[model samples]
Target: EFALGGRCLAFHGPLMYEAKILKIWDPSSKMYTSIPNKEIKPQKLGEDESIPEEIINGKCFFIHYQGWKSSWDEWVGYDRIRAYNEENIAMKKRLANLE
Candidate 1:
């Protein structure tokens, strides 16, 4: 978990993408109030039209997708990422070619 700031590969849908860990954003509520659960309000709401009632709970880390313009950064489970070693790289290449 101490690999913060190091480059690695992360699972994103059909591919494993190159990315970096920005932080170990472990157990917490990624609050978003757009949900129907109006009982759990983070605050009195705000100027933003959308409510903040969403949550993704569990152990995960904030990752930055390197191939992108930083618009797709997100938190992914530890199991979804892997070491950037030769074995994993080969698997990635093989999987990519399957597309």
Candidate 2:
């Protein structure tokens, strides 16, 4: 699980961007997708509850891209992001320059 306000490397398509986790949530709707090892199924929700635009296999983090405005903050699923580190930092740079 990611710590709120923690540093991370979030993905924006094929590129990994510097970001910070501002919020986090784990919704059961992730069962709809077959990406995770968990079995897929319809999500449960009460009349008062609503579904979000994005779903997560583990936990979702609201990430704000560095050097970007708050308007660019987005909800990213677990696999879509990774902890910032030298290894990942190299990949992040490599992917951007792969073209």
Candidate 3:
């Protein structure tokens, strides 16, 4: 996998995970196509989730962004806002392996 691009602002940023292509459809023009070995809707959620106009603006302001590195201070709650570098992630995986 390629390294994640360093950028975050809510609306646009590097995607969290990888995915496989499902299907493609176009309305009005009535075009249907399928992509192979490509990640379709990887940046977007699946059908079960809903995307509303108001939600976009509301969350954009409410959300916070941080860089990839973790901090030494615990007073800020979680020094690392992004969980990837957090120790809990590896701890959880180890616990799962024990089970």
Candidate 4:
């Protein structure tokens, strides 16, 4: 999102960010583990872990935000169960069955 006259220029609403968080570390000293939260399962990720509330508890929903600012800690809107279900089904059919 861009800034326009001290306001938001455009808003694409909430998007499905189903991915992992990668980090850079120096394993030379004595690092081993791959670092937690790097490849997170959105559903299981902690609610306080910065993930959108819509995707909490392993459920997909349409999330909306009120303002445009900080990289985090912003309120977001969400979709209802029916909408999410329909969208999810459509996405599956398009991505899986149809070519």
Candidate 5:
């Protein structure tokens, strides 16, 4: 189970932003909202970085920001995150075929 202080690196295109899980709104869905820990600077992806374990296990989600200005937040699921890269995307297809 994820706690209030749980932190995650949110991916936005080639950038990653630091965020902390603030609260859980839906116990059934394990849905939660996170906020920027600071001013939220963007970092380049792949400094040997990895997503949170909860995300990989489909236990949590982070709000993703869209648009340059006047952005709106969208909840991005773990499944969608896994498909972000071709390597994992292809692996999913292979695993699907195996099943």
Candidate 6:
């Protein structure tokens, strides 16, 4: 159920950040089966620049961004999922238990 209006956690450099779900595309969907895509917008907590596609592609879950003190986007890459900070760490554990 990863629809629009939802926010998720992503990575940037060596820190975690937040990303907003802009759009969702499912290749399995009959409508967009030929062209599937997911759009996410990420922003750092105190950083100036926004997250690029590469980092945004590393989103983990629909939770607050972690790391020491960083901020947030996308569904392109599905590599290693990282969690930082108290909030994110707790949530990450909770998510792990679910699986």
* Best model number under lDDT: 2
Candidate 6 on 1-99: residue-level lDDT in tens? 343445555544544455544443332331211112644333232244233445443442333332332232333333433323578656655655763
Q: Which 10-residue window in model 4 sums to the lowest lDDT?
A: 1-10
- Lowest summed lDDT across 10 adjacent residues in model 6 is found at 27-36
- What's each prediction's TM-score? 0.63, 0.68, 0.18, 0.17, 0.30, 0.33
Better-scoring candidate (lDDT), 1 or 5: 1
Q: How would the candidate models be sorted by lDDT, starting from the highest?
A: 2, 1, 5, 6, 4, 3
How many backbone clashes are present in model 1? 8
Q: Please provide, for model 3 over 1-99, each residue's C-alpha lDDT reduced to its tens digit, 9 standing for 90 to 100.
A: 111232211211222211121222233332323333444332333356333343332221112234322331111111112333345445445545763
On residues 1-99, what C-alpha lDDT tens digit does candidate 1 reach at each position? 336677788889878888887655433453332223146343332365221123235555567888687778766766688788898888888889976
How good is model 4 by TM-score? 0.17
Q: Is candidate 5 or candidate 6 better by TM-score?
A: 6
Model 5, runs deviating above 4 Å: 23-59, 64-73, 79-99
Off by over 4 Å in 4: 1-55, 60-67, 71-99
Model 4 per-residue lDDT tens digits across residues 28-72: 332212234344222222345443444333322222223433352
Q: Give the per-residue Cα lDDT of candidate 5 at 6.
A: 59
Range of the 10 consecutive residues with the lowest summed lDDT in candidate 1: 49-58
Model 6 regions more than 4 Å off: 29-75, 80-99
Report the lDDT of model 6 for residue 68: 33
The backbone clash count of each candidate, in order, is 8, 0, 0, 1, 0, 7
TM-score order of candidates, top first: 2, 1, 6, 5, 3, 4
* lDDT tens per residue, model 2, 1-99: 356678999889878999988656656543222122224334433356333565544566767899998887767787678988899899998999983
What lDDT does candidate 1 reach at residue 47?
Answer: 67
lDDT of each: 0.63, 0.69, 0.27, 0.29, 0.41, 0.39
lDDT of 5 by residue, 32-67 (tens): 334445343323223653445444344444443332
